[PDB]
């Protein structure tokens, strides 16, 4: 299943944590924090 266009996902475990960003939000303002703005 392809992930939701606008739910950014945080996951934390023994390895620490990560944030994963939908391909639809890269190139939006919400991508700017991740180095992937417009």
């Amino acid at each position: 299943k392809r992930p939701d266009p606008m739910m950014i996902r945080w996951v934390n475990n023994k390895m620490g944590s990560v944030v994963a960003v939908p391909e639809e939000l890269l190139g939006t303002h919400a991508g700017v924090v991740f180095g992937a703005g417009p």
Partner: protein
């Protein structure tokens, strides 16, 4: 013995022994209620008496699978007013032909000769003049003007957008070198710049943080947010309405009693607005920007007086069923699955509902 629900109905119907004879018909319903009161009258989701008009559905068979549910709810109390009063200038604030005062008076009293308009304020902004302080209150002439013309609800919506930046300064500009710095245009907001509430939220030992939440914690810890409601209003009604035979009244009813801006503020941003804001190339501040409707204090009853019958209530509503529940749990631990025989066939259905609640097996 009989549960109080059984006992009440049984007593009211056995009282008919004094009135009539029919004895067989009565003693049949004795056996009914003494088995379970839901055989006699099913407990079902219920609400206060509605003292209002609504549109009844006249037929189910004619209705079809797609139906429009209009909001039909209206008051039976019904205030007939002529349009001469309600529309054609008997309302002094409503400008139009006839009401020639209202249009002049609105402009001059709210703008021209109104002290809060920026041009008037700007003439009073120095020395001993009545707006001298406005340099040191953090509002601009525009915000002061707005706050003097918008009502308490609209002003409270505007507060929802703002950042308590003077509270953050209390965390940062601490030290003698910081001189407890404050922006000079906020100089008079002393109690915002110096307030334990901000510090108590940042310290890691939450001692004063907890001392400030005592009331809300213990309220919740007492379970009062989850305990069943012990009362509700016996009657409920919608607001009384003007009835006027004009179209302006119908528009103005919708503008006030179903006020779009208040409703939008309470219920928050619309889903397409959330989509536009999240997919936009640059950030945009939504309105309002969040749902300003509070959380309900009762975490289960929320904002309505509708009760749903509990299965625990159903169990205890029959004295036999309440007594049988202990015996069946004993019999379960005795190694027996449920096996019972009934003089009334409909009681088998209630036991299937009971067993599908309990998840014990036949």
């Amino acid at each position: 013995e009989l549960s109080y629900r059984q006992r009440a109905m049984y007593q009211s119907l056995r009282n008919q022994i004094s009135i009539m004879d029919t004895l067989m018909n009565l003693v049949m319903q004795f056996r009914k209620v003494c088995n379970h009161p839901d055989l006699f009258e099913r407990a079902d989701t219920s609400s206060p008496f509605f003292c209002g008009h609504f549109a009844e559905t006249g037929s189910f068979l004619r209705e079809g699978t797609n139906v429009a549910l209009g909001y039909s709810t209206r008051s039976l109390v019904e205030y007939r007013l002529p349009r001469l009063i309600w529309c054609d200038g008997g309302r002094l604030d409503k400008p139009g032909p006839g009401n020639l005062v209202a249009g002049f008076r609105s402009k001059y009293l709210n703008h021209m000769m109104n002290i809060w308009t920026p041009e008037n304020i700007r003439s009073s902004l120095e020395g001993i003049e009545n707006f001298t302080w406005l340099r040191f209150v953090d509002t601009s002439l525009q915000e002061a003007y707005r706050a003097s013309h918008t009502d308490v609800f609209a002003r409270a919506v505007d507060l929802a957008s703002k950042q308590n930046r003077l509270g953050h300064m209390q965390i940062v500009y601490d030290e003698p070198e910081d001189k407890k710095w404050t922006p000079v245009h906020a100089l008079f907001q002393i109690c915002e710049r110096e307030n334990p509430k901000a510090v108590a939220e940042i310290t890691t030992e939450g001692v004063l943080r907890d001392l400030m939440n005592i009331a809300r914690v213990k309220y919740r810890e007492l379970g009062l947010c989850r305990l069943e409601k012990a009362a509700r209003p016996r009657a409920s009604a919608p607001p009384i309405e003007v009835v006027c035979d004009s179209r302006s009244a119908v528009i103005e009813r919708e503008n006030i009693m179903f006020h779009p801006a208040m409703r939008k503020a309470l219920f928050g941003p619309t889903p397409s607005e959330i989509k536009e804001a999240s997919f936009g190339p640059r950030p945009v501040t939504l309105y309002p920007p969040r749902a300003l409707l509070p959380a309900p204090d009762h975490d289960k009853q929320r904002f309505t007086n509708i009760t749903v019958p509990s299965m625990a209530r159903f169990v205890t509503d029959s004295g036999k069923l309440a007594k049988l529940d202990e015996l069946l749990r004993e019999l379960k631990e005795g190694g027996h699955r449920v096996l019972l025989y009934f003089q009334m066939t409909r009681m088998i259905d209630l036991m299937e509902e009971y067993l599908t609640y309990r998840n014990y097996k036949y």
